[PDB]
A paper describes a structure:
The [name]-[name] protein complex in [name], belonging to the adenosine triphosphate–binding cassette transporter family, is a spermidine-preferential uptake system. In general, ATP binding, hydrolysis, and phosphate release trigger conformational changes in the transporter, leading to the uptake of extracellular polyamines. Here, we report structural details of the polyamine uptake system [name]-[name] in various states.
Author numbering:
A (entry chain B): 7 to 279
B (entry chain D): 16 to 373
C (entry chain C): 5 to 253
D (entry chain A): 15 to 374
Write the structure that this text describes.
């Protein structure tokens, strides 16, 4: 009873999470095979192909579209949590559950529905023209702008939940002390609230940025061929090209970003606690 | 005349907490507000500090109206019961926060902060986060943060509740000396009779947002105004007396707790009036009655002796069924008053050492 | 007055795609761009469709099974962490926290290569393990957060009163954790039904699921039965969540 | 008659030996209180006695039965926790009846026992009321009632009345004393308060760093400490320095105490030039007022503080040397009111044979 759960929970994570990742990291050392797809031959030919401008402009182009989505979520998410903590306690649980209910529909079906709504001849173009605000339909499809709209739409609920927990756990007399000492609201925001809730911001940025760099059906449906994400490239190299070692090399460029972000969470948390 | 509060009204969630309050605070004194838990003392403190606005009335500070002046422009600092201490700043920066926020030239900031820390004996802890200190050090840091801005009046909100019984006794004297050396008004809020009684020059007793009595500790302890105050502070004894007739301008004869003694009354009385006699436990004389001669005082009994070291207080249960709870001292003539259990006694007081109300 | 406007705008942003699919379900136009009357032909076409119904059944079955197993394992792990004190608890907390903060494509590929190396056919079992594995951390966090709000010396006090280790669990710990387990069950159920990348990677052709069929059928053209199918699952899901709420209380 | 005998008990925790060695015996039918500073290891002893922890060595016997390795499910020992450790989802009735139900008590006897136990603590009305609707005093009453029902041979209290306010705590102190007299079993109490330990206990054991420092009656502890830690820990003391010149008689020794000569009472042998410790309590000092060269016998000092407490007046006198002496005076004698200034020069004496002389 006492020891069974500890071994079992440790045995489950190791067998299913940590051990497969080390092979992925060690899968970029072998060569390419047309049979078992690998061969014991230490090589570094995979990496120099990353620096190719063809394969290097795509990586840079994906990061730009992922950062703007995270910032748009952060501009739209921190204020959203602030108004929720200033509401009666009897309505807070209901409103949180009303943010997860769109999830009862599959993610791939929600994007297709968004495509018809924003189409050129669809709504928001007939209605926006019918009540004169514009003179010609606004075309956003198959543009980098269209991709940003999709990333925000899917991943917005993943940022509100971490911020609400951090905001709700603040000490009310702590914020009140600055007002007495002589700090205004603007001054109170920059020098007290933000440093205290930094671990919440960092955690929320991790749950919206990294998943946004692997969603390939958003680019397939709304981006076109020129606007591709790392998720589209890796899927092709594994299921169609069947070049596993190169796909593993592309994935580490995404894991490296994880390591940089984790250090900031620990040092921001250690400085506060 | 420092702070004048005129006709202040306050409503909270539709419930009135401050019906109508008129209070004047002089300059350069230590004032303590006393009352039971949750009686609007915190509301009054927050109103003076500026975190809330009145629903009616006027507030005057130094003959300048500050009724609607925001919390940013007042020269009053407060030390909180939560010991607000920003956790991501060192002690130096914690003290210097107020100076930096007021746009002070940087050549004077360091000396002022360092002198303020030296005032409260915190020289060594210049750079230590507010999680490496003890409770007393936190108290000192909060006081130094409040008083570094040179305020015109310092507000304390239940300051030393969470510490032990010895550091508490040290810092009571430390605060009284800091107040005397600085020379500014101190306003203190506590639920303890000992601190308010032993630390103040004037005490205001509050109850449901109304002032019961305001005066020096001697007056409040010796000359209460009603039965609530006489019993809220210290320990009191309630004797029911019925006046029979008047002997002279000061003495009257009555039936107190089934017996007939002469009590001192300095106001007009008429026969048949029901009276109240109040007595402190130390204001009571007791003698054993081992022999059959039981007389000279209320009879009572002994139900429980709780000795305390320097003194010994014993509770006497009369024939009617009321506890009396006497207290005695250890003198040269009385080295030890060792009483047995269920032993008959005799109850007496000291002439003219009593207070009678109506 | 301006506070409610911001709250409504975000909700309108998150519900308009949903509103479009229900109305387009009752539309008569095949493309669905405009409104050309009311009809129910799409419902009848969906009821006689077999592959779509099989895919929906498979998705629902996977969601139910994965939610039950994830809830059970996560609740047990959280109780173990709460009840016992040892040096490695922060370490276990870090493993769960890190595995939650993980990209989906990397997890998908790791399980893909793991199943390919061992020699296990891709299908029911591999998908089940993947969904439980990425559903565990949320359940653990929810139940542990609920449990941490109660005093832990209570268990020892009950122990002094004469309770064995097995008896404390059924009579004391469980009734204080039932709303968290039920809450962790609904949350696990929702995640296992909106995940696309792992399912699209770690599956085969023996077990066909709903995302893959719709993804294959989108390129040629999506008939409104999918619009008809989306609204059927929503009503069926609205009654499963309310049943969980009733049972726990 | 001894009831519990702790013989050679040793305890180690995380490589730090919290309890080096403890030998102790507890008699049957008394109120015992363990007193010491916060964090000395009293709670560890309490848990060890209850059975929630094990010894690295030694033996514990209860009524000539070794219960060293008997699990904490058959011992007749119950403990009351400070936060009341009450189950919130059960009722008061079920809270009380938990122990009885788990011991397979027949159903026809459970209800009367529960009802009488609640009546013994005056909780008749609140049988069917859930927790979180009860005040702190009610929760202590519920905890005591729950512990008492099983008829234990040892009721263990763990800082029971720390969270309550003043008047309720003072009332419940007498209530616990009366309840202990009514039942007839040994009560063991752990506390940090001085007057709280002094008020109720018929026997006090003071522990520091795992060792027992003193053990005896409250009078025996307040008046004859064996060393400075116990004397200063309980009550208030005035530490005085003295140098022995010569011995005068069998109970008087010439001495130089705090700068001046004085005759003190010493029973044990002493040699000239020796250093002794003179311990006095604030109420033992006799102090007059030197206004204009009047009553100038004794030490000379100045007043730096004065405290009015309503029933007595406390005074902090500063000597010429620089030592702070605490003096307490009472108004009960025939000086109704008096009050000192803040720079008065004052004289200090004390009554003979009321000293406490400590060597070394």
């Amino acid at each position: 009873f006492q020891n069974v759960v500890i071994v079992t929970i440790v045995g489950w994570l190791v067998l299913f999470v940590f051990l497969p990742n080390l092979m992925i990291i060690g899968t970029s050392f072998l060569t390419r095979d047309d049979a078992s797809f690998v061969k014991m031959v230490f090589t570094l030919d995979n990496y120099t192909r990353l620096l190719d401008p063809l394969y290097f402009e795509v990586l840079l182009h994906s990061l730009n579209m992922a950062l703007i989505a995270t910032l748009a979520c952060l501009v739209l998410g921190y204020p959203f949590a602030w108004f929720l903590a200033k509401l009666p306690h009897k309505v807070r649980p209901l409103l949180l559950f009303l943010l997860i209910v769109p999830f009862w529909t599959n993610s791939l079906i929600r994007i297709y529905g968004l495509k018809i709504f924003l189409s050129t001849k669809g709504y928001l173009n007939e209605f926006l023209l019918w009540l004169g605000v514009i003179d010609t339909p606004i075309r956003i499809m198959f543009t980098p702008s269209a991709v940003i709209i999709g990333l925000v739409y899917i991943l917005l609920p993943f940022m509100v939940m971490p911020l609400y927990s951090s905001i709700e756990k603040l000490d009310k007399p702590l914020l009140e002390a600055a007002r007495d000492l002589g700090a205004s609201k603007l001054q109170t925001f920059i020098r007290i609230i933000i440093p205290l809730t930094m671990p919440g911001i960092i955690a929320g940025c991790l749950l919206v940025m990294l998943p946004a760099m692997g969603l390939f059906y958003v680019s397939d449906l709304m981006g076109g061929a020129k606007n591709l994400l790392i998720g589209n490239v890796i899927k092709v190299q594994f299921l169609n090209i069947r070049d596993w070692p190169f796909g593993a090399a592309t994935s580490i460029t995404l894991t490296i970003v994880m390591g940089l972000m984790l250090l900031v969470y620990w040092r921001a948390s250690r400085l506060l606690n | 005349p420092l702070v004048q509060l005129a006709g202040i009204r306050k409503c909270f969630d539709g419930k009135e907490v401050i019906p109508q309050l008129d209070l004047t605070i002089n300059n350069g004194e230590f004032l303590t507000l006393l009352g039971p838990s949750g009686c609007g003392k915190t509301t009054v403190l927050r109103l003076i500090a500026g975190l809330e606005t009145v629903d009616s009335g006027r507030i005057m500070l130094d003959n300048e109206d500050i009724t609607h002046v925001p919390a940013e422009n007042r020269y009053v600092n407060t030390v909180f019961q939560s010991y607000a201490l920003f956790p991501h700043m060192t002690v130096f920066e914690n003290v210097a926060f107020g100076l930096r926020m007021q746009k002070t030239p940087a050549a004077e900031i360091t000396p002022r902060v360092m002198e303020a820390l030296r005032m409260v004996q915190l020289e060594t802890f210049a750079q230590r986060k507010p999680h490496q200190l003890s409770g007393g050090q936190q108290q000192r840091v909060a006081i130094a943060r409040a008083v570094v801005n040179k305020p015109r009046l310092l507000l304390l909100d239940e300051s030393l509740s969470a510490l032990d019984y010895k550091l508490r006794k040290q810092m009571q004297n430390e605060l009284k000396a800091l107040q005397r050396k600085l020379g500014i008004t101190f306003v203190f809020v506590t639920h303890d009779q000992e601190e308010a009684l032993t630390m103040s020059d004037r005490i205001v007793v509050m109850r449901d947002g109304r002032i019961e009595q305001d005066g020096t500790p001697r007056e409040i302890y010796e000359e209460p105004k009603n039965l609530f105050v006489a019993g809220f502070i210290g320990e009191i004894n309630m004797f029911n007396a019925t006046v029979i007739e008047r002997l002279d301008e000061q003495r009257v004869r009555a039936n107190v707790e089934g017996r007939e003694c002469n009590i001192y009354v300095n106001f007009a009385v008429e026969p048949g009036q029901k009276l109240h006699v109040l007595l402190r436990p130390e204001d009571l004389r007791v003698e054993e009655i081992n022999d059959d001669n039981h007389a000279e005082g209320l009879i009572g009994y002994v139900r429980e002796r709780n000795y305390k070291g320097m003194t010994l207080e014993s509770v006497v249960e009369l024939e009617n069924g009321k506890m009396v709870m006497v207290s005695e001292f250890f003198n040269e003539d009385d080295p030890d008053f060792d009483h047995s259990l269920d032993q008959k006694m005799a109850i007496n007081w000291v002439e003219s050492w009593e207070v009678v109300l109506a | 007055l301006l506070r409610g406007g911001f709250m409504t705008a975000i909700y309108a942003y998150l519900y308009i795609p949903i509103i479009i699919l229900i109305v387009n379900s009752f539309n008569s136009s095949r493309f669905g761009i405009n409104w050309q009357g009311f009809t129910t032909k799409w419902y009848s076409l969906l009821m006689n469709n077999d592959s779509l119904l099989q895919a929906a059944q498979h998705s629902l079955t996977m969601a139910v099974f994965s939610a039950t197993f994830a809830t059970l394992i996560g609740s047990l792990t959280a109780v173990a962490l709460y009840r016992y004190r040892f040096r490695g608890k922060p370490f276990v907390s870090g493993m769960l926290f890190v595995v939650m903060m993980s990209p989906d494509i990397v997890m998908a590929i790791s399980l893909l290569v793991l199943f390919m190396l061992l020699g296990i056919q891709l299908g029911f079992w591999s998908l089940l393990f993947s969904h439980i594995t990425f559903c565990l951390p949320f359940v653990v966090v929810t139940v542990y957060s609920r449990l941490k709000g109660f005093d832990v010396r209570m268990l020892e006090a009950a122990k002094d009163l004469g309770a064995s280790e097995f008896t404390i669990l059924r009579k004391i710990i469980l009734p204080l954790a039932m709303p968290a387990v039920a809450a962790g069950w609904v949350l696990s159920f929702t995640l296992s039904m909106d995940d696309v990348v792992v399912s699209s990677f770690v599956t085969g052709p023996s077990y066909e699921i709903l995302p893959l069929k719709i993804y294959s059928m989108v390129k040629v053209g999506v008939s409104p039965e999918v619009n008809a199918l989306a609204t059927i699952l929503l009503v069926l899901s609205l009654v499963m969540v309310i049943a969980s709420q009733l049972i726990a209380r």
